[PDB]
């Protein structure tokens, strides 16, 4: 770095000359601009119009990635308004774009760095609209982001998250579909992971519903239920000591024999989570005398490192 300033100035002059004015060259320029650091306001505003008036999907996704990476430096009321407008355009793109991949990339790009602006009411409404998206993965990302924002703006998030929790719970209870129930369980797990404060008062009904689901006569749904139970164990913080006995009975019953469609990995992980959260030690050995034997046999049987 003998002259890093000179190198950066030359590189910026070259990029400015390139961008003052085919499709592959534009893609390469966008990749270069988003690749590493630079020293950028007019470019952001111009590329904002660029990706709007670009029908090329590759150009749109490259521009979205470049905008996300360039907005990393995020007190000027003018600059804050500029960043807010750019973020609003980014959100309208990530909601209204027909391309699921572009919307997924836009939503993934919205990291913790944009939490302050994203906490506004319009952004929260956009996220609320986005939560009911066709793409299930986009739904998971949106609910994770919203739950992450439950502390910044509780008044707008906690009621909406309560409504979504109600919808997820009734979906799990009533829909007799493996795919729908699995998606509901995954969304419930994401909500538990991201919004412990909202769910803590509602730990009991969620746990009761998950238990009722467990007692029902697809591996994905049961694995998601076990993972959600494991997360809820951490969230509750000893508040589920009443149901730890039933949880242990069910987990051990499904743990013995490989006929159960549930993976033993998630079962062991959630058993460990229950033990850690509820402080249930030594007593399970006395209550369940085969537990130690099963755990030792897993050392000889199972081959996965995890």
């Amino acid at each position: 770095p003998q002259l890093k300033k000179d190198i950066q100035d030359g590189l910026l002059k070259m990029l400015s000359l390139v961008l003052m004015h085919d499709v592959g060259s534009i893609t390469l320029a966008l990749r270069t601009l988003g690749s590493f650091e630079f020293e950028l306001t007019q470019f952001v505003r111009h590329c904002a119009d660029h990706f709007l008036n670009s029908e090329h999907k590759e150009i749109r996704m490259e521009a979205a990635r470049t905008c996300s990476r360039l907005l990393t430096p995020s007190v000027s009321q003018t600059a804050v308004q500029v960043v807010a407008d750019v973020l609003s355009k980014l959100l309208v793109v990530g909601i209204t774009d027909p391309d699921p991949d572009i919307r997924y990339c836009v939503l993934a790009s919205l990291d913790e760095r944009f939490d302050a602006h994203l906490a506004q009411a319009e952004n929260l409404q956009a996220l609320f609209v986005a939560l009911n998206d066709q793409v299930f993965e986009i739904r998971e990302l949106a609910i994770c982001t919203v739950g992450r924002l439950s502390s910044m703006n509780p008044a707008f998030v906690m009621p909406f998250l309560r409504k979504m929790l109600i919808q997820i719970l009734t979906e799990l209870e009533h829909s007799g579909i493996g795919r729908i129930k699995e998606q509901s369980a995954r969304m419930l797990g994401h909500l538990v992971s991201n919004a412990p404060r909202l769910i803590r008062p509602y730990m009991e009904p969620i746990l009761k519903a998950l238990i009722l689901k467990l007692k029902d006569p697809n591996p994905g749904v049961i694995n998601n239920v076990l993972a959600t139970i494991g997360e809820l164990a951490q969230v509750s913080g000893l508040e589920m000591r009443k149901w730890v006995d039933e949880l242990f009975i069910i987990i051990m019953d499904m743990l013995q024999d490989s006929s159960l469609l549930a993976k033993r990995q998630v079962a062991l992980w959630t058993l460990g989570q229950l033990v850690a959260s509820t402080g249930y030690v030594v007593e399970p050995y006395r209550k369940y005398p085969t537990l130690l034997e099963v755990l030792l046999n897993f050392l000889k049987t199972e081959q996965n490192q995890g």
């Binding site: 003018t78 302050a116 506004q120 009411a121 707008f156 009991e204």
Partner: protein, 1052 residues
């Protein structure tokens, strides 16, 4: 580097008073005022329950619905149950409107209803009257528009025409119907109102209607819910809401909750600290929030703000609509309300209800302490989050009614007031919206509280309120809240900013309002202001002076009180205040104090003459704004003594004579606006009516400060502002220019004969000045100021100085040449003026400020670093004007009869050197006293000193050249010249370059000799050369002969 030098440079004549035109901001039409206050004097409760008999139209199920107003009719017998339900419903309505006349009709007849309606109408002819109807025990209303009631024998249902019913009633009234087909009732009522309107040619909006169900729809028959569902919702929204919540599937979220638990809930509807009161308060806040968010502002004001009872009825009506939607029932209102069941706030309502009732099992059984719901805290947090980014005029926040609701209590009152003040700081629109929402009465009631912690928040909020709307002064006087502000102002421990805000509030209160003026005179405001008159805060002093002037506005009692307190003598001090704004405020106060003499005793005449003499010495004030205020005060003086001034004026066709001379001086002012005002005032004297009085907008201009945001960080301090980036770019360009000039100087100076361009001007070039960094050259002519370019070679602008023909522009200066430069134009008479936007494409000539100075021609030597300005001329005194304070600082005696032909000064030192016509060159040091300012006085010339320039180097050399053309190099530390040279026998003009020792000499024979300080010959350019200038950085030379030709030279 040289960037720090540019950064720490004061920007003269660049402030609020200079940039923004002085004027009052136009007052918007504030419609937030309540047009009228209606009251529901009487309530009519018609209960066609028909206990013990089922209407033939509907065959109810064996369980059916047996709860009407939370009473089982079959338990206590028919008549006893009917009376008990009537009394209970009266109590329910009293819960919302205790002060009303309640008359109950229990299965009445047509004649009974007619008599009751007529009696109630007579009781309240011009006020709203509630007519409640419950047709559960009668058949459904007919399509014809009839209501079934009972005959005397209770054997037949006698119909009752809606047209007749509204004939009995008047225009101001409301109607509530609880029946299966109330939609038919509403449609019939509207049709009959239309029929009345049609008849009227050869009472709809005033009438208000509430309906339990649509015409087609029927009331629910679920056994769990009460039969009197709509009325229960309208009367007991909390109870019915809790019951409905305990029926939804959401109870699965909180097991162990039953209707029995809901019945035994602790708390009252009034005690907000109790769970029941907390739920009621939260529900009211949420319903008001939904109403304001959904409904338009006008309908919101007309419905939820007109009166308590209607607002409560509609706030319960929203909940009733939401609950009825779940049972295929659509409540109907006469003003069609957009649906509100889908609003997100109901989710918050459900969440708060669940959180609050989750503790009930522990409250009843274990007996824990009921913790308050965090709903309001979360809503205020959301409002704060909105305010954090809500600078832009985006959609208004949804929490303004929530803020209003929180203001009532004390647990979160301080935070709510803080957040509301921050919101009002945003701008006038935010304060207007806050007035619309109905925050005025509550912030007015807040004055009664004696809590000292509320004083800063309250004073800030009220300062914003009065800044936006000025009509609140009457309400403040009525509440007697001005005493609160007097107490706040009379507290030295209070910070100066809040005391300044309190002074502004009080000044607005007494702004052309007699009742408030005399109330504050009774409040001893004059003494309090005098006590905090010398406070070390320019804004506070200015506003205290403005308030004091406003107090005695056409109020002799305040004038007498000030005379007793000698307010005039104490206020004379502010006339010398460094801040021009404070001087203007003091002049305004003194003028207003003069204007209300009203022919008092000889003491008044004497004190008025003393005030006139005290104001007469402010003629030599640099600020034209202060001079305009002096003109206004002198207009007050004239209108007080019109006959005396008329006599004095007729004398010339000894106090008033001096005031008339002062008015003449003000008339001949360089500032066009002040000159016009003074000339108009003087002409008003000649033809001697009230219309001649002119009031400046200075008061409202200062008031506009509180309208603008303050809490936010200034744009200048921000690192990323476009303005700061532009300033940094200009600084970088200036540094590069300086470095290039230094490089050129180090390489040496070659012969300069290149002529960049040759152009002709309309007038003779008097003085030429180059802009230090931008390529703009200022060439001043006899009656015009030409602005040419030495790169583009085109004419940019053509100004007109406006000075009289006899006068002549002698010098020129570029103030703030580093960036955002100004142009200083000094005429030979003393008229000094400042030009802005002189060489811009999209802007026209602008005059920032102007003021007559003093009173060879005129000589000026600007010093950017210290910000001092000095003018010299025929007068034997060198004046030192301070642009920061707009006042002369020192007037050093020259000690010479001859005029000051030239003047210069040294940076970082007081080495003021002034040339003289006799030939002698004096030097003055301002660090010592005025009599000791003179340092050296050497006389080695007998001629007019063409240019007594000084080198910016520490070893400053005074190169004095006279008309004789003999060059002598003097030094401030030596009594004799070091080098003596003779160049041209007859010299007409000369210029020197500080960076490059190039002495450019003129000649009558077109010769332009460019020599060195040592006298070495360099160039003798062959063409009365009366204008030469050198670029401050580049070795550029411009030479102008007697002909109006301009050239710019460069060294290759």
């Amino acid at each position: 580097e040289a960037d720090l030098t540019d950064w720490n440079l004061p920007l003269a004549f660049m402030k609020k008073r200079h940039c923004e035109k002085i004027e009052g901001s136009k007052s918007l039409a504030q419609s937030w005022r309540m047009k009228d206050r209606m009251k529901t004097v009487s309530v009519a409760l018609v209960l066609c329950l028909n206990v013990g008999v089922d209407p033939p139209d509907v065959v109810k199920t064996t369980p059916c619905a047996r709860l009407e107003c939370w009473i089982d009719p079959l338990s206590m017998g028919p008549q006893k149950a009917l009376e008990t339900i009537g009394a209970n419903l009266q109590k329910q309505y009293e819960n919302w409107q205790p002060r009303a006349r309640y008359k109950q009709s229990l299965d009445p007849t047509v004649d009974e209803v007619k008599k009751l309606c007529t009696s109630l109408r007579r009781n309240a002819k011009e006020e709203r009257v509630l007519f409640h109807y419950n047709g559960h025990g009668v058949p459904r209303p007919t399509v014809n528009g009839e209501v079934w009631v009972f005959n005397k024998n209770y054997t037949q249902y006698i119909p009752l025409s809606i047209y007749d019913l509204q004939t009995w009633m008047g225009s101001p009234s409301i109607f509530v119907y609880d029946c299966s087909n109330a939609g038919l009732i509403v449609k019939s009522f509207k049709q009959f109102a239309l029929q009345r309107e049609q008849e009227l040619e050869v009472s709809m909006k005033n009438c208000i209607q509430l309906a339990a169900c649509e015409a087609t729809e029927l009331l629910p028959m679920i056994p769990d819910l009460p039969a009197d569902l709509f009325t229960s919702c309208l009367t007991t929204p909390i109870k019915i809401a809790l019951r409905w919540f305990c029926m939804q599937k959401c109870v699965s979220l909180v097991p162990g909750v039953t209707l029995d638990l809901i019945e035994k809930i602790p708390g009252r509807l009034n005690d907000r600290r109790t769970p029941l009161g907390e739920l009621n308060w939260i529900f009211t806040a949420i319903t008001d929030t939904i109403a304001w968010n959904v409904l338009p502002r006008d309908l919101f004001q007309k419905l939820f703000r007109q009166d308590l009872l209607v607002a409560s009825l509609f706030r319960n009506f929203l909940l009733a609509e939401r609950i009825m939607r779940s049972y295929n029932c659509t409540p109907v209102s006469s003003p069609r309300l957009p649906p509100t069941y889908m609003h997100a706030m109901w989710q918050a309502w459900d969440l708060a209800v669940d959180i609050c009732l989750s503790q009930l099992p522990t409250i009843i059984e274990e007996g824990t302490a009921f913790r308050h719901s965090p709903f309001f805290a979360e809503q205020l947090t959301a409002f704060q989050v909105w305010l954090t980014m809500g600078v832009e005029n985006r959609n208004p926040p949804e929490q303004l009614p929530i803020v209003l609701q929180v203001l009532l209590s004390q647990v979160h009152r301080l935070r709510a007031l803080d957040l509301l003040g921050r919101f009002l700081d945003l701008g006038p629109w935010a304060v207007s919206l806050a007035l619309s929402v109905g925050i005025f009465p509550y912030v007015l009631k807040l004055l009664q509280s004696s809590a000292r912690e509320l004083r800063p928040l309250l004073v800030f909020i009220w300062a914003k309120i009065l800044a936006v709307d000025s009509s609140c002064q009457a309400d403040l006087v009525k509440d007697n809240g001005h005493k609160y502000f007097l107490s706040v102002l009379a507290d030295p421990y209070m910070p100066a900013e809040h005391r300044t805000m309190t002074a502004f509030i009080l000044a607005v209160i007494v702004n052309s309002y007699h009742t408030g003026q005399e109330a504050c005179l009774q409040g001893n405001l004059i003494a309090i202001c005098l006590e905090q008159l010398n406070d070390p805060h320019p804004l506070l002093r200015q506003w205290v002076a403005i308030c004091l002037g406003r107090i005695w506005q056409n109020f002799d009692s305040a004038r007498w009180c000030g005379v007793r307190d000698s307010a005039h003598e104490k206020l004379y001090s502010l006339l010398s205040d460094p801040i021009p704004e404070v001087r203007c405020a003091a002049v305004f106060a003194l003028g207003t104090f003069v204007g209300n003499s009203a022919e008092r005793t000889d003491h008044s005449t004497t004190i008025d003459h003393n005030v006139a003499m005290m104001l007469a010495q402010l003629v030599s004030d640099g600020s034209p704004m202060v001079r305009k205020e002096l003109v206004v005060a002198l207009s007050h003086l004239v209108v007080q003594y019109e006959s005396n001034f008329c006599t004095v004026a007729l004398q010339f066709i000894s106090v008033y004579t001096q005031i008339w001379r002062v008015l003449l001086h003000l008339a001949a002012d360089p500032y066009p606006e002040v000159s016009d005002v003074a000339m108009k005032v003087l002409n008003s004297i000649a033809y001697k009516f009230i219309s001649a009085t002119v009031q400046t907008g200075f008061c409202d201009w200062s008031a506009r400060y509180f309208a603008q945001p303050v809490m936010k960080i200034p744009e200048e301090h921000d690192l990323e502002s476009q303005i700061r980036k532009e300033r940094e770019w200009r600084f970088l360009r200036n540094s590069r220019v300086r470095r290039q000039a230094q490089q050129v100087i180090q390489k040496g100076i070659t012969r300069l004969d290149d002529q960049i361009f040759l152009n002709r001007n309309p007038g003779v070039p008097s003085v030429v000045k180059f802009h230090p960094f931008t390529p703009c050259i200022a060439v001043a002519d006899k009656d015009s100021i030409c602005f040419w370019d030495w790169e583009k070679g085109e004419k940019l602008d053509y100004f007109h100085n406006g000075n009289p023909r006899y006068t002549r522009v002698t010098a020129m200066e570029y103030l703030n040449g580093q960036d955002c430069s100004l142009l200083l134009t000094a005429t030979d008479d003393g008229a000094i003026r400042v030009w802005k936007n002189f060489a811009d494409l999209e802007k026209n000539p602008e005059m920032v400020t102007a003021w007559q100075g003093l009173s060879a021609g005129m000589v000026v030597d600007w010093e950017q670093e210290t910000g001092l300005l000095m003018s010299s001329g025929d007068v034997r005194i060198v004046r030192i004007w301070d642009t920061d304070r707009e006042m002369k600082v020192q007037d050093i005696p020259t000690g010479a009869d001859s005029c000051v032909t030239s003047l210069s000064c040294d940076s970082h030192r007081s080495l003021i050197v002034a040339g003289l016509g006799d030939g002698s060159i004096r030097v003055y040091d301002r660090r010592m006293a005025l009599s000791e300012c003179r340092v050296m006085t050497y006389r080695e010339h007998t001629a007019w000193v063409v240019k007594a320039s000084l080198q910016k180097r520490p070893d400053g050399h005074i190169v004095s050249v006279s008309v004789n053309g003999d060059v002598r190099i003097f030094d401030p530390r030596m009594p004799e010249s070091v080098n003596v040279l003779q160049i041209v026998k007859g010299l007409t003009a000369l210029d020197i370059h500080p960076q490059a020792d190039l002495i450019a000499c003129g000649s009558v024979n077109q010769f332009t000799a460019i020599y060195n300080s040592s006298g070495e010959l360099i160039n003798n350019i062959k063409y009365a050369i009366s204008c030469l200038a050198f670029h401050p950085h580049w070795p550029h030379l411009a030479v102008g002969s007697n002909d109006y030709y301009i050239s710019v030279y460069s060294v290759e």
